[PDB]
Paper text:
CPV4, 5 and 20 lack both ATP and GTP, whilst the other cypovirus types have varying combinations, in all cases the V1, V3, V4, V2c or V5 regions of the protein adopt alternate polypeptide conformations. NTP binding in this area is only observed in CPV1 and CPV20. The pyridine in CPV20 is not well ordered, but can be identified as UTP based on the limited space and the hydrogen bonding environment provided by residue 101 main chain nitrogen and the side chain nitrogen of H79, whilst the triphosphates are supported by two lysines, two histidines and an arginine. The pyridines stabilise the dodecamer, although in CPV1 the CTPs also interact with each other, whilst the UTPs in CPV20 are more deeply buried in the trimer interface. In CPV1, 14, 15, 17, 18 and 20 solvent molecules can move between these two voids, whereas in CPV4, 5 and 19 they are blocked by tyrosine residues. CPV1, CPV19 and CPV20 were resistant such that only a small portion was dissolved in an hour while the other six cypovirus types plus the two deletion mutants dissolved dramatically. In fact the three CPVs (CPV1, 19 and 20) most resistant to alkali buffers all display more extensive interactions between the 3-fold symmetry-related subunits of the trimeric building block – strengthened by either pyridine binding (CPV1 and CPV20) or numerous protein–protein hydrogen bonds.
Cypoviruses, members of the family Reoviridae, subfamily Spinareovirus, possess a single capsid layer with turrets and are commonly embedded in crystalline occlusion bodies called polyhedra, which are formed in the cell cytoplasm and mainly composed of a single virus-encoded protein, polyhedrin. To ensure the delivery of virus particles to the target intestinal cells, allowing the transmission of packages of infectious virus between hosts by oral-faecal routes, polyhedra are disrupted only when they are exposed to the very alkaline pH environment found in insect midguts. The fold of all the polyhedrins is highly similar – a β-barrel core sitting on a base domain, surrounded by a common array of five helices (H1–H5).
Numbering used by the authors:
A (entry chain A), B (entry chain A), C (entry chain A): 2 to 243
């Protein structure tokens, strides 16, 4: 007799592990986490700031950092508006709003992130969470938390923030999960955590429309929910029906 | 009989606690600390940089960071002056001094700060505290300390630094006090300290004159001693005579 | 009798200790470490960024940070090129290469540095070490290590990096050695390490030619190997033949 039906089936498995690798890769300690801060402007276009780090992504946008471009030609206008906002009434500023101050923020946070410890806070013009610094803290009662970000998958969550005023700024923290109960802020591991956490702030990108934006998010595999509330990217691997 | 003289006196106490709150609020762990770095220029006006953080405010101004505005129209002039200063004699620079290099620094430090551990250092053109980097350290023997800052109150101290040259830069550290003997750089607390310490550097503000400056310091409740050595703001709460 | 041949010989020793001081000075804990990142451009000139810190020098250059000057007059060109590079094909960019993107990097690292823990990595256009962020880590398999930097002396090593493409960026880490087996990331010492590590990024300097560059490196006593592979500066003290 003879048994010729021994076609190997390792290929299926190799591809399968490549698929799992993309989903589990982010969960290895010192794997990269990736956050996209996306501002929407009055011209309907976007400015996207891409962050990555292996321990935690924190940072801020002061009031000035919120603006669309802030070119030399508009520096005086922006200076005076900033004066009026951050020190009324000392700005030679003649309009209630700037064309270049955003109308909303979208945040795509991706990776092995401790959602419980995530903080996203819309601060005032001095980047504080209280009117008086003497009552301000690291984070306040109006802070956004991880569970408030819309879940796209196990890898990514997405937050929408309307800006109904033009005096606000932004402060955020997206920290890694540890490996089980191993706190790497222990003496064994903390030196490496501190020295490895180089928080990359890539130069802001300008995207004309939401089609181009969806394309970017899908290209970089960062989760995105479009203006119609449809999840177009969730950070996960491609697959066919099970 | 009847006892109609029972007018409540809780109101006095409520206001009183609001007053104490502003003075004690800064002393809660993870309360915000606030520092204003103020440069004075040859046009008699000011450039103010507002910092806040919950663990410690450190940072620096390299030589270029010292300048008033540094607009594109003056970029070449400033580049060449920087060359001559930081690498003599390689600058096509034709004047001993720049109009836009400051003549003095004022620092208003406010909050629950460990004054013993405060460091403010006027560095050389390479932002080092010795002529030769091989003898330079984190801090040097000419470093300003907390006790050298003029005390305005329990909440705030104020330092004046004359700049008699135009080759100097700045490095500083304003760290929080701990709660008694609880070192939060212990393994229990340090992760939070590190991830919470997002040092906000607000965009520099331009203030025309000292009247406008006093107004700002009083509005933001940051301590200030004016050019006549009078304490105009001390970070404390308003009150009537005791 | 009389013994008039008692000419003192302390002077020799005083100078000798001054010489040793420059070589050993960097090895005191909290002594400064100094790193020069030097880019070479298509006009044959250099842009040098001078860093110093007492605990560790880490940082990065995102893609935009790589460019020579990036003046307002060339902002549009640079924006569009960045678009095409970081999000193809969304840049209105008409040339394969920019005049202002560097052709090589030279890194002079100097001081009491733990060469074993040094990391210098040429990242892609998103400043990641893998094509897909989900497989990216703090550092990757193509990372440069301390032993790959050409040794100039006990104080300094020098690395050359050719840039054969124009999509790459940079991330680096140069950490201090500890005093023997005393890990200052222990609870006793870590607060000071964290608060003292103010990583100075001096404004980029523009140097016309290699003669001017050699002069700078020798003036600042940072190690340098010239285009002919000759060590012109090694960070050590001057001396006569032994
Ligand atoms: O960030 C921005 C940028 C531009 N702009 C808008 O650009 C326009 C350019 O200014 P104008 O076109 O109105 O010229 P102008 O000299 O009359 O300016 P003002 O009298 O208003 O000072 C201004 O009217 C302003 O509203 C903003 O409001 N915000
Ligand atoms: O930061 C600054 C800004 C401006 N300035 C001053 O602005 C003035 C503008 O320069 P000028 O008005 O003298 O024109 P110019 O072409 O003659 O310039 P030079 O011959 O001096 O190169 C210069 O004389 C300079 O002293 C500074 O010195 N420092
Ligand atoms: O970073 C830089 C800076 C300058 N340049 C170069 O400067 C030159 C200035 O551009 P041109 O002198 O070609 O004028 P132009 O209006 O024809 O520009 P294009 O048609 O090429 O858009 C361009 O040809 C560009 O190649 C760079 O390529 N990269």
């Amino acid at each position: 007799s003879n048994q010729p039906f021994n076609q190997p089936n390792v290929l299926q498995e190799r591809q399968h592990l490549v698929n799992r690798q993309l989903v589990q890769g982010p969960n290895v300690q010192d794997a990269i986490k990736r956050v996209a801060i996306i501002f929407i402007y009055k011209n309907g276009s976007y400015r996207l700031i891409d962050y990555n780090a292996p321990e935690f992504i924190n940072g801020y946008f002061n009031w000035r950092d919120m603006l669309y471009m802030d070119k030399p030609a508009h520096s005086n206008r922006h200076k005076e508006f900033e004066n009026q906002i951050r020190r009324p009434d000392h700005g030679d500023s003649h309009h209630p709003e700037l064309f270049e101050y955003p109308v909303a923020i979208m945040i795509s946070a991706n990776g092995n992130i401790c959602w419980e410890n995530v903080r996203v806070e819309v601060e005032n013009e001095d980047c504080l969470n209280h009117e008086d610094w003497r009552r301000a803290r690291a984070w306040g009662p109006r802070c956004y938390k991880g569970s408030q970000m819309m879940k796209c998958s196990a890898l990514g969550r997405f937050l929408y923030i309307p800006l109904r005023c033009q005096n606000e700024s932004l402060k955020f923290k997206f920290p890694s999960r540890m490996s089980g109960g191993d706190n790497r802020y222990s003496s064994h591991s903390i030196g490496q955590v501190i020295q490895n956490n180089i928080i990359i702030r890539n130069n802001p990108l300008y995207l004309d429309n939401e089609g181009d934006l969806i394309d970017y998010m899908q290209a970089k595999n960062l989760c995105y929910i479009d203006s119609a509330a449809v999840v177009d990217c969730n950070g996960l691997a491609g697959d066919s029906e099970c």
